[PDB]
Coordinates of C-alpha atoms and ligand atoms in Angstrom, one line a residue:
Chain A
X1 CA -71.8 -9.2 91.3
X2 CA -69.7 -8.1 94.2
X3 CA -69.6 -11.6 95.6
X4 CA -66.9 -13.2 93.4
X5 CA -64.3 -15.8 94.0
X6 CA -61.5 -14.4 96.2
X7 CA -64.0 -11.9 97.7
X8 CA -64.0 -11.6 101.5
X9 CA -66.9 -11.6 103.9
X10 CA -67.5 -11.5 107.7
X11 CA -69.1 -14.6 109.1
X12 CA -70.5 -14.8 112.7
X13 CA -68.5 -16.7 115.3
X14 CA -69.2 -17.6 118.9
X15 CA -65.9 -16.4 120.4
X16 CA -65.3 -13.2 118.5
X17 CA -68.4 -11.6 117.2
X18 CA -67.4 -11.8 113.6
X19 CA -64.6 -13.6 111.8
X20 CA -63.1 -13.2 108.3
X21 CA -63.7 -15.7 105.5
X22 CA -62.6 -15.7 101.9
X23 CA -65.2 -16.6 99.3
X24 CA -63.6 -19.7 97.8
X25 CA -66.1 -20.2 94.9
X26 CA -68.0 -17.3 93.3
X27 CA -71.7 -17.0 94.1
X28 CA -74.6 -17.2 91.8
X29 CA -78.4 -17.1 92.6
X30 CA -78.1 -20.0 95.2
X31 CA -78.1 -21.5 98.7
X32 CA -74.3 -22.3 99.1
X33 CA -71.1 -20.5 99.9
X34 CA -67.7 -22.2 99.8
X35 CA -65.6 -20.4 102.3
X36 CA -62.0 -20.6 103.5
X37 CA -60.7 -19.6 106.9
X38 CA -57.3 -18.6 108.3
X39 CA -60.0 -24.4 107.5
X40 CA -62.6 -25.3 105.0
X41 CA -66.3 -24.6 105.4
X42 CA -69.7 -24.3 103.7
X43 CA -72.2 -21.8 105.0
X44 CA -75.9 -21.8 104.6
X45 CA -77.3 -18.7 102.9
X46 CA -80.7 -18.4 104.5
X47 CA -83.8 -16.3 105.1
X48 CA -82.5 -13.5 103.2
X49 CA -79.0 -12.2 103.9
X50 CA -75.7 -12.2 102.0
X51 CA -72.8 -12.2 104.5
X52 CA -71.5 -8.7 105.1
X53 CA -68.9 -7.9 102.5
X54 CA -65.4 -6.6 103.6
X55 CA -63.8 -3.3 102.9
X56 CA -60.7 -3.1 100.8
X57 CA -57.6 -2.8 102.9
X58 CA -56.7 0.7 101.9
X59 CA -59.8 1.9 103.8
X60 CA -59.1 -0.2 107.0
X61 CA -57.4 1.8 109.8
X62 CA -58.3 5.3 108.6
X63 CA -59.0 8.0 111.1
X64 CA -62.7 8.3 110.4
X65 CA -65.0 5.3 110.5
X66 CA -67.3 7.0 107.9
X67 CA -64.4 6.8 105.4
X68 CA -65.2 3.1 105.2
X69 CA -67.2 2.1 102.1
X70 CA -69.1 -0.8 103.7
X71 CA -70.4 0.5 107.1
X72 CA -71.5 -2.4 109.4
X73 CA -70.7 -3.8 112.8
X74 CA -67.7 -6.0 112.0
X75 CA -65.9 -3.4 109.8
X76 CA -66.3 -0.9 112.6
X77 CA -65.1 -3.4 115.2
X78 CA -62.2 -4.3 113.0
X79 CA -61.0 -0.8 112.4
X80 CA -61.2 0.0 116.1
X81 CA -59.5 -3.3 117.0
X82 CA -56.6 -2.8 114.5
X83 CA -56.0 0.9 115.5
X84 CA -56.0 0.0 119.2
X85 CA -54.0 -3.2 119.2
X86 CA -51.6 -2.5 116.3
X87 CA -51.2 1.3 116.4
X88 CA -52.0 1.8 120.1
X89 CA -54.1 4.8 119.0
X90 CA -57.0 5.2 121.4
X91 CA -59.0 8.0 119.7
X92 CA -61.0 7.7 116.5
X93 CA -63.6 9.9 115.0
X94 CA -67.0 8.6 114.0
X95 CA -68.7 11.4 112.1
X96 CA -68.9 14.3 114.6
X97 CA -68.4 11.9 117.5
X98 CA -65.0 11.1 119.0
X99 CA -64.7 7.5 120.1
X100 CA -62.2 7.0 123.0
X101 CA -61.1 3.5 124.2
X102 CA -59.8 3.0 127.7
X103 CA -56.2 1.8 127.5
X104 CA -55.8 1.0 131.3
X105 CA -52.3 2.4 130.7
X106 CA -50.5 5.7 130.8
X107 CA -49.5 7.3 127.5
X108 CA -47.2 10.1 126.4
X109 CA -49.8 11.9 124.2
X110 CA -50.9 14.4 126.8
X111 CA -47.6 16.3 126.9
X112 CA -47.7 20.1 126.7
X113 CA -45.7 20.0 123.4
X114 CA -48.7 18.1 121.9
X115 CA -51.1 20.5 123.5
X116 CA -49.3 23.3 121.6
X117 CA -49.2 21.2 118.4
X118 CA -53.0 20.9 118.5
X119 CA -53.7 24.5 119.3
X120 CA -55.0 26.4 116.3
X121 CA -55.5 23.3 114.2
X122 CA -58.8 22.3 112.6
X123 CA -60.1 18.7 112.8
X124 CA -59.1 17.8 109.3
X125 CA -55.4 18.6 110.0
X126 CA -54.5 16.2 112.8
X127 CA -55.2 12.7 114.0
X128 CA -58.1 12.6 116.5
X129 CA -57.4 13.4 120.1
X130 CA -59.5 14.8 123.0
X131 CA -57.5 18.0 122.6
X132 CA -58.8 18.2 119.0
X133 CA -62.3 18.4 120.5
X134 CA -61.3 20.9 123.2
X135 CA -59.6 23.1 120.6
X136 CA -62.7 23.0 118.4
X137 CA -65.0 24.0 121.3
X138 CA -62.5 26.8 122.2
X139 CA -62.4 28.3 118.7
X140 CA -66.2 27.9 118.2
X141 CA -66.5 30.0 121.5
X142 CA -64.0 32.5 120.1
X143 CA -65.8 32.9 116.7
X144 CA -69.3 33.4 118.3
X145 CA -70.0 34.2 121.9
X146 CA -72.3 31.2 122.0
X147 CA -71.4 28.8 124.9
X148 CA -70.0 25.4 124.0
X149 CA -70.6 22.0 125.5
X150 CA -68.6 18.7 125.6
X151 CA -70.7 15.6 126.2
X152 CA -69.1 12.4 127.4
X153 CA -71.1 9.2 127.5
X154 CA -70.5 5.5 128.3
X155 CA -70.6 2.8 131.0
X156 CA -68.9 3.8 134.2
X157 CA -65.2 2.8 134.1
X158 CA -64.8 3.9 130.5
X159 CA -62.6 6.8 131.6
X160 CA -65.0 9.8 131.3
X161 CA -63.4 11.6 134.3
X162 CA -59.9 11.4 132.9
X163 CA -61.2 12.6 129.5
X164 CA -62.8 15.6 131.2
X165 CA -59.5 16.2 133.2
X166 CA -57.4 16.4 130.1
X167 CA -60.0 18.4 128.4
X168 CA -59.8 21.1 131.0
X169 CA -56.0 20.8 131.2
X170 CA -56.1 21.8 127.6
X171 CA -58.0 25.0 128.4
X172 CA -55.7 25.8 131.3
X173 CA -52.6 25.4 129.1
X174 CA -53.9 27.3 126.1
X175 CA -55.4 30.2 128.0
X176 CA -52.7 30.3 130.7
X177 CA -53.3 31.2 134.3
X178 CA -56.0 30.6 138.6
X179 CA -55.9 27.0 139.8
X180 CA -59.3 25.8 138.7
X181 CA -58.3 22.4 137.4
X182 CA -56.7 21.5 140.7
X183 CA -59.9 22.4 142.7
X184 CA -62.1 20.6 140.2
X185 CA -60.0 17.5 140.5
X186 CA -60.0 17.9 144.3
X187 CA -63.8 17.9 144.3
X188 CA -64.1 14.4 142.7
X189 CA -63.6 12.3 145.9
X190 CA -66.7 13.8 147.7
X191 CA -68.9 13.7 144.6
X192 CA -67.9 10.1 144.1
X193 CA -68.6 9.4 147.7
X194 CA -72.0 10.9 147.9
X195 CA -73.0 10.1 144.3
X196 CA -71.6 6.7 143.3
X197 CA -72.8 3.2 144.2
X198 CA -71.9 -0.3 143.5
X199 CA -74.1 -1.9 140.8
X200 CA -74.5 -5.6 139.8
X201 CA -72.2 -5.1 136.8
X202 CA -69.9 -2.4 138.1
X203 CA -68.4 -0.8 141.2
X204 CA -68.3 3.0 141.4
Chain B
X1 CA -67.5 25.9 128.0
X2 CA -69.3 23.1 129.9
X3 CA -68.5 19.4 130.2
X4 CA -71.3 16.9 130.9
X5 CA -70.4 13.5 132.4
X6 CA -73.5 11.3 132.1
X7 CA -74.2 7.5 132.1
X8 CA -75.0 5.7 128.9
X9 CA -77.7 3.3 127.8
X10 CA -78.1 0.5 130.3
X11 CA -79.4 -3.1 130.1
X12 CA -79.2 -5.9 132.7
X13 CA -80.7 -9.4 133.0
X14 CA -83.3 -7.6 135.2
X15 CA -84.5 -4.1 134.3
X16 CA -86.2 -1.8 136.8
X17 CA -87.3 1.8 137.4
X18 CA -83.7 3.1 137.7
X19 CA -82.8 1.5 134.3
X20 CA -86.1 2.9 132.9
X21 CA -85.2 6.5 133.9
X22 CA -81.7 6.1 132.6
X23 CA -82.8 4.8 129.3
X24 CA -85.4 7.6 129.0
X25 CA -82.7 10.2 129.7
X26 CA -80.6 8.5 127.0
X27 CA -83.4 8.6 124.5
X28 CA -83.7 12.3 125.1
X29 CA -79.9 12.9 124.7
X30 CA -79.9 10.7 121.6
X31 CA -82.7 12.7 120.0
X32 CA -80.9 16.0 120.6
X33 CA -77.8 14.4 119.1
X34 CA -79.5 13.1 116.0
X35 CA -81.1 16.5 115.4
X36 CA -77.8 18.3 115.8
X37 CA -76.1 16.0 113.3
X38 CA -79.0 16.4 110.9
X39 CA -78.6 20.2 111.2
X40 CA -74.9 20.0 110.5
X41 CA -75.5 17.8 107.4
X42 CA -78.1 20.2 106.0
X43 CA -75.5 23.0 106.5
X44 CA -72.8 21.0 104.7
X45 CA -75.2 20.2 101.8
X46 CA -75.8 24.0 101.5
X47 CA -72.1 24.4 101.5
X48 CA -71.8 22.0 98.5
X49 CA -75.1 23.2 96.9
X50 CA -76.6 19.7 96.9
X51 CA -80.4 19.4 97.2
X52 CA -81.5 18.9 100.8
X53 CA -84.1 16.2 99.9
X54 CA -81.5 13.5 99.6
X55 CA -80.9 13.3 103.4
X56 CA -83.7 12.0 105.6
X57 CA -84.2 12.5 109.3
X58 CA -84.3 9.4 111.6
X59 CA -86.6 10.3 114.5
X60 CA -87.0 8.5 117.8
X61 CA -89.8 10.9 118.9
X62 CA -92.4 8.1 118.8
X63 CA -90.5 6.3 121.6
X64 CA -90.3 9.5 123.6
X65 CA -94.1 10.0 123.1
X66 CA -94.5 6.4 124.2
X67 CA -92.7 7.1 127.5
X68 CA -93.7 10.6 128.4
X69 CA -96.9 11.6 126.6
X70 CA -100.2 11.7 128.5
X71 CA -101.4 8.1 128.8
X72 CA -97.7 7.3 128.7
Chain C
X1 CA -45.4 -24.9 61.5
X2 CA -43.2 -26.5 58.7
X3 CA -40.7 -29.2 59.0
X4 CA -37.8 -26.8 59.3
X5 CA -39.4 -25.0 62.2
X6 CA -40.2 -28.3 63.9
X7 CA -36.6 -29.4 63.5
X8 CA -35.1 -26.2 65.0
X9 CA -37.6 -26.4 67.8
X10 CA -36.8 -30.0 68.5
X11 CA -33.1 -29.2 68.5
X12 CA -33.6 -26.4 71.0
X13 CA -35.9 -28.6 73.0
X14 CA -33.1 -31.2 73.2
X15 CA -30.7 -28.5 74.2
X16 CA -33.0 -27.8 77.2
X17 CA -33.1 -31.6 77.9
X18 CA -30.8 -31.9 81.0
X19 CA -31.2 -35.7 81.2
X20 CA -30.5 -36.9 77.7
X21 CA -33.8 -38.8 77.3
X22 CA -35.0 -36.4 74.6
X23 CA -37.6 -34.8 77.0
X24 CA -38.2 -31.7 79.1
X25 CA -40.2 -31.2 82.2
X26 CA -43.7 -29.7 82.1
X27 CA -42.2 -26.7 83.9
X28 CA -39.9 -26.2 80.9
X29 CA -42.8 -26.3 78.3
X30 CA -43.7 -22.7 79.1
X31 CA -40.0 -21.7 79.1
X32 CA -39.6 -23.2 75.6
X33 CA -42.7 -21.5 74.3
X34 CA -41.4 -18.2 75.6
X35 CA -38.0 -18.9 74.2
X36 CA -39.6 -19.3 70.8
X37 CA -41.1 -15.8 70.9
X38 CA -44.5 -16.5 72.5
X39 CA -45.6 -14.6 75.6
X40 CA -48.1 -16.8 77.4
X41 CA -49.3 -16.3 80.9
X42 CA -48.5 -19.0 83.5
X43 CA -52.2 -19.7 83.5
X44 CA -52.2 -20.2 79.8
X45 CA -49.1 -22.4 80.0
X46 CA -50.7 -24.6 82.6
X47 CA -53.9 -24.7 80.5
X48 CA -52.0 -25.9 77.4
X49 CA -50.0 -28.2 79.8
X50 CA -53.3 -29.6 81.1
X51 CA -53.0 -28.0 84.6
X52 CA -50.3 -30.5 85.7
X53 CA -49.9 -31.5 89.3
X54 CA -46.9 -30.6 91.4
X55 CA -45.5 -34.1 91.2
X56 CA -45.5 -34.4 87.4
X57 CA -44.5 -30.7 87.2
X58 CA -41.4 -31.5 89.1
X59 CA -40.5 -34.9 87.9
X60 CA -42.5 -36.0 84.8
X61 CA -40.6 -35.5 81.5
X62 CA -42.2 -35.0 78.1
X63 CA -40.6 -35.3 74.6
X64 CA -41.1 -32.9 71.7
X65 CA -44.1 -34.9 70.3
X66 CA -46.2 -34.2 73.4
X67 CA -45.0 -30.6 73.7
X68 CA -45.9 -29.9 70.1
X69 CA -49.7 -29.7 70.3
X70 CA -49.3 -27.3 73.2
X71 CA -47.0 -25.0 71.2
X72 CA -49.4 -25.1 68.3
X73 CA -52.4 -24.3 70.6
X74 CA -50.5 -21.3 72.1
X75 CA -49.5 -20.1 68.6
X76 CA -53.1 -20.2 67.5
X77 CA -48.1 -2.5 70.7
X78 CA -50.6 0.2 71.5
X79 CA -52.4 -1.9 74.1
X80 CA -49.1 -2.9 75.6
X81 CA -48.2 0.8 75.6
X82 CA -51.4 1.8 77.4
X83 CA -50.7 -1.0 79.9
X84 CA -47.4 0.5 80.6
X85 CA -48.9 4.0 80.7
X86 CA -51.0 2.7 83.6
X87 CA -47.9 3.0 85.8
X88 CA -46.8 6.4 84.3
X89 CA -47.6 11.4 82.1
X90 CA -44.0 12.3 81.2
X91 CA -43.2 9.0 79.5
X92 CA -41.4 7.6 82.5
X93 CA -41.9 5.0 85.2
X94 CA -40.2 4.8 88.6
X95 CA -37.8 1.9 88.8
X96 CA -38.8 1.4 92.5
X97 CA -42.5 1.4 91.5
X98 CA -42.1 -0.9 88.5
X99 CA -40.1 -3.3 90.7
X100 CA -42.7 -3.2 93.4
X101 CA -45.6 -3.9 91.1
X102 CA -43.9 -6.7 89.2
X103 CA -42.7 -8.3 92.5
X104 CA -45.9 -7.7 94.5
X105 CA -49.0 -7.9 92.3
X106 CA -50.4 -10.5 90.0
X107 CA -48.4 -13.6 89.4
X108 CA -45.4 -12.3 91.3
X109 CA -41.9 -12.8 89.7
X110 CA -38.6 -13.0 91.4
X111 CA -36.4 -10.0 92.1
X112 CA -33.6 -11.4 90.0
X113 CA -35.8 -11.6 86.8
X114 CA -37.0 -8.0 87.4
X115 CA -33.4 -6.9 88.0
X116 CA -32.3 -8.6 84.8
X117 CA -35.0 -7.1 82.6
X118 CA -34.6 -3.7 84.3
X119 CA -30.8 -3.6 84.3
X120 CA -29.6 -0.6 82.3
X121 CA -33.1 0.7 81.7
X122 CA -33.6 3.2 84.5
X123 CA -32.0 6.6 84.4
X124 CA -30.5 8.8 87.2
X125 CA -33.8 10.0 88.4
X126 CA -34.9 6.4 88.6
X127 CA -37.2 6.6 85.6
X128 CA -37.7 4.1 82.8
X129 CA -38.6 5.1 79.2
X130 CA -41.5 2.6 78.9
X131 CA -41.9 3.0 75.1
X132 CA -38.2 2.0 74.6
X133 CA -38.4 -0.7 77.3
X134 CA -41.5 -2.1 75.7
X135 CA -40.1 -2.1 72.2
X136 CA -37.0 -3.8 73.6
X137 CA -38.9 -6.6 75.4
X138 CA -41.2 -7.1 72.4
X139 CA -38.4 -7.3 69.8
Chain D
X1 CA -82.8 23.4 128.4
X2 CA -79.2 23.8 129.6
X3 CA -77.9 21.8 126.6
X4 CA -80.2 23.2 123.8
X5 CA -79.0 26.7 124.8
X6 CA -75.5 25.5 123.9
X7 CA -73.6 24.0 121.0
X8 CA -72.6 20.4 121.8
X9 CA -69.5 18.3 121.0
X10 CA -69.8 14.6 121.7
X11 CA -67.3 12.1 123.2
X12 CA -68.1 8.4 123.6
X13 CA -66.0 6.3 125.9
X14 CA -65.8 2.5 125.6
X15 CA -64.2 -0.1 127.9
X16 CA -62.6 -2.8 125.9
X17 CA -62.3 -5.5 128.6
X18 CA -63.7 -6.1 132.1
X19 CA -60.4 -7.2 133.8
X20 CA -58.5 -3.9 133.1
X21 CA -55.7 -5.6 131.2
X22 CA -53.6 -2.9 129.5
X23 CA -54.2 -2.7 125.7
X24 CA -56.3 -5.9 125.5
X25 CA -59.5 -5.8 123.5
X26 CA -62.5 -8.1 123.6
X27 CA -64.9 -8.1 120.7
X28 CA -67.9 -9.3 122.7
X29 CA -67.5 -6.7 125.4
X30 CA -66.9 -3.9 122.8
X31 CA -69.8 -4.8 120.6
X32 CA -72.0 -4.4 123.7
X33 CA -70.6 -1.0 124.5
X34 CA -70.6 0.3 120.9
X35 CA -74.2 -0.7 120.9
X36 CA -75.0 1.0 124.2
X37 CA -73.1 4.1 123.2
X38 CA -75.3 4.4 120.0
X39 CA -72.2 4.4 117.8
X40 CA -73.6 1.5 115.9
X41 CA -76.9 3.2 115.3
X42 CA -75.2 6.4 114.4
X43 CA -73.2 4.4 111.8
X44 CA -76.4 2.7 110.5
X45 CA -78.0 6.1 110.1
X46 CA -74.9 7.3 108.2
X47 CA -74.8 4.2 106.0
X48 CA -78.0 5.4 104.5
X49 CA -77.2 8.6 102.7
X50 CA -73.8 9.7 101.4
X51 CA -71.2 8.6 104.0
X52 CA -68.2 8.7 101.7
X53 CA -66.9 12.0 100.4
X54 CA -63.9 12.7 98.1
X55 CA -62.3 15.9 96.9
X56 CA -62.1 16.0 93.1
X57 CA -58.3 16.5 93.3
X58 CA -57.6 13.4 95.5
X59 CA -60.2 11.3 93.5
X60 CA -58.5 12.1 90.2
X61 CA -55.0 11.4 91.7
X62 CA -56.3 8.0 93.0
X63 CA -58.1 6.9 89.8
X64 CA -56.2 8.3 86.8
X65 CA -55.5 4.6 86.1
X66 CA -59.2 4.0 85.3
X67 CA -59.3 6.9 82.9
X68 CA -58.5 6.4 79.2
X69 CA -56.1 9.0 77.8
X70 CA -58.8 10.0 75.4
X71 CA -61.0 11.3 78.3
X72 CA -58.4 12.9 80.6
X73 CA -59.1 16.6 80.4
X74 CA -57.0 19.3 82.1
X75 CA -60.2 20.3 83.9
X76 CA -60.4 17.5 86.6
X77 CA -64.0 18.2 87.6
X78 CA -65.5 17.5 84.1
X79 CA -63.2 14.5 83.6
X80 CA -64.6 13.1 86.8
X81 CA -68.2 13.8 85.8
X82 CA -67.6 12.1 82.5
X83 CA -65.8 9.1 83.9
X84 CA -67.9 8.2 87.0
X85 CA -71.0 8.1 84.8
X86 CA -69.3 5.4 82.7
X87 CA -67.9 3.5 85.7
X88 CA -71.1 3.7 87.8
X89 CA -74.4 3.3 86.0
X90 CA -76.8 5.1 88.4
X91 CA -76.6 8.8 88.8
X92 CA -78.6 8.3 92.1
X93 CA -75.5 6.5 93.5
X94 CA -73.5 9.7 93.6
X95 CA -73.8 13.5 93.7
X96 CA -71.4 16.1 92.2
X97 CA -70.8 18.7 94.8
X98 CA -69.0 22.0 94.2
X99 CA -65.6 20.7 95.5
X100 CA -66.3 17.1 96.7
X101 CA -67.9 14.0 95.2
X102 CA -70.4 12.3 97.5
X103 CA -70.8 8.5 97.2
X104 CA -73.3 6.0 98.7
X105 CA -71.7 3.3 100.8
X106 CA -71.0 0.6 98.2
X107 CA -69.6 2.7 95.4
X108 CA -66.1 3.5 96.6
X109 CA -65.3 -0.1 97.3
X110 CA -66.6 -1.1 93.9
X111 CA -64.3 1.4 92.3
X112 CA -61.4 0.1 94.4
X113 CA -62.3 -3.4 93.2
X114 CA -62.4 -2.6 89.5
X115 CA -59.2 -0.6 89.9
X116 CA -57.4 -3.5 91.5
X117 CA -58.7 -6.0 88.9
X118 CA -57.6 -3.7 86.0
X119 CA -54.2 -3.2 87.6
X120 CA -53.9 -7.0 88.2
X121 CA -54.6 -7.7 84.5
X122 CA -52.1 -5.1 83.4
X123 CA -49.5 -6.4 85.8
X124 CA -49.9 -10.0 84.6
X125 CA -49.8 -9.1 80.9
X126 CA -46.6 -7.1 81.4
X127 CA -44.9 -9.7 83.5
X128 CA -45.7 -12.5 81.1
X129 CA -44.1 -10.3 78.4
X130 CA -41.0 -9.9 80.6
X131 CA -40.8 -13.6 81.4
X132 CA -41.1 -14.3 77.6
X133 CA -38.2 -12.0 76.8
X134 CA -36.1 -13.5 79.5
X135 CA -36.7 -17.0 78.2
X136 CA -36.0 -15.9 74.6
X137 CA -32.6 -14.6 75.9
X138 CA -32.0 -17.9 77.7
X139 CA -32.8 -19.6 74.4
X140 CA -30.2 -17.5 72.7
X141 CA -27.8 -18.7 75.4
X142 CA -29.0 -22.3 74.9
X143 CA -28.1 -22.1 71.2
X144 CA -24.8 -20.4 72.1
Ligands
LIG301 N1 -57.1 8.4 128.3 C1 -56.7 7.6 129.3 N2 -55.4 7.5 129.5 C2 -55.0 6.7 130.5 N3 -55.7 6.0 131.4 C3 -57.0 6.2 131.1 C4 -57.6 6.9 130.1 N4 -59.0 6.9 130.2 C5 -59.2 6.1 131.2 N5 -58.1 5.6 131.8 C6 -58.0 4.7 133.0 O1 -59.3 4.2 133.2 C7 -59.5 4.0 134.6 C8 -60.8 4.7 135.0 O2 -60.8 6.0 134.4 P1 -61.7 7.2 135.1 O3 -61.8 8.4 134.2 O4 -61.1 7.4 136.4 O5 -63.2 6.6 135.1 P2 -64.1 6.5 136.3 O6 -63.4 6.9 137.6 O7 -64.6 5.0 136.5 N6 -65.4 7.5 136.1 P3 -66.8 6.5 135.6 O8 -66.5 5.9 134.3 O9 -68.1 7.4 135.5 O10 -67.0 5.4 136.7 C9 -58.2 4.5 135.3 O11 -57.4 3.4 135.6 C10 -57.6 5.4 134.3 O12 -56.2 5.5 134.4
LIG302 MG1 -61.7 5.8 138.6

């Protein structure tokens, strides 16, 4: 079966939601797994679940989470954690969706040379970036007069405003110019004043 | 081209009419998402000439009818 | 094996005896088997050796008489070619790629062993004729 | 009504830690926000179906090693159709598209596993042959 000796599985852990373990003795149908941890453990296999298997490392870190063969919570969390911590990439496709992780830091990627590099390129060509969504919307609008939307969702403080800001900066740069983006960014203080509130979990 | 900044799904130790409205709006947006993705998959399956039947729709309409139908 | 073979093997065995007690280490048993034309895996060598522990592998010495049953047990091209064609289809193999796979997969060997076996076998493109290299290492 | 008139593109934003430390990540915060952003249900809904898709060209390039030289045709697509049916028992588990092969979730990792185990066996067998030659050379030295 897939669960052989020197297989790897994700096991639940209190302090990080899942942790890796290597299957130290191959499994047969029943109640036991001998597991080894970066030490030595036995884990009850219980109703029933086998522990989530782990993707082969060639798949880990790829630009699209649906490129993973096993799709499950710890494999997704691992691919986002490695891309963010090791690569310091903050953008990752999931299917159609673009996932964007708040770095709480400035980054060089929003330079106008990169704006030009993205312009005219389809989503397959380049690593994910918010400009790669803006450019898709722009060319969908060009092909067919149908209006286009960009929809940004997440808990407040996840950076939705800065994502919109760079999204419209893309349009301003690619179309050329009419000082819209300045006025739109200048409107945010009043809309935040009248429209935002402290909440138990979150300010603004 | 239009850009929509909206809150996501919300859960606290105490949940109340505000969280109920926010979670119902998010159920609506998530339905419209799932149905757009399903449309695009049916298009890609046409593009590869694969039978459509293989893909099944996952429908949160019963929870919307739970919240907003008459006698909801 | 006949008496003559056993005598030549014992003489060679004593030549590999670096202490003069008529014995080799467990870690030399595999070396002697390979030196006599066999190509056992390290796993096979440890199996015929009885899966020795680190301590006896590094310091326990065995004479010809204990080695002999193991040599007997071990004793008792197209597949090799396809195995090399795995890493090919112009009949060549990258020297960098062969070096990488031999030093990074399986029961990894040292870079010096790989350099020794590969010395003189790669061309200017950095390609190895694997049929010739295979015949050479099987001769 | 405003959105259904329009064609959407979706962005999900997640907040990896509460304390705003630059480039730090917290698994228990993020699993909460990936759950709240519906990324995890989107992935669950994609895990049923055919989430993994391969061009015949890149598939063949990746897995020539599995193919026996008997069954490598110069048409890649028919080679692939022949081979995958040997390597995977169930025709349900994959579909042959015009230009791309569609796999269910498990299958590509299973092919990577059997590829790696074959390549391990070939590596070990070759390297034991090399070690055997080098010890035979050292025996020739030990006689000399
Ligand atoms: N792509 C990004 N690059 C750099 N900093 C970012 C990025 N996204 C978010 N941030 C930072 O995240 C913090 C908040 O981002 P912002 O877009 O202003 O969210 P916001 O004001 O809280 N809107 P909301 O999430 O609805 O409350 C700021 O410190 C930003 O600098
Ligand atoms: Mg802010």
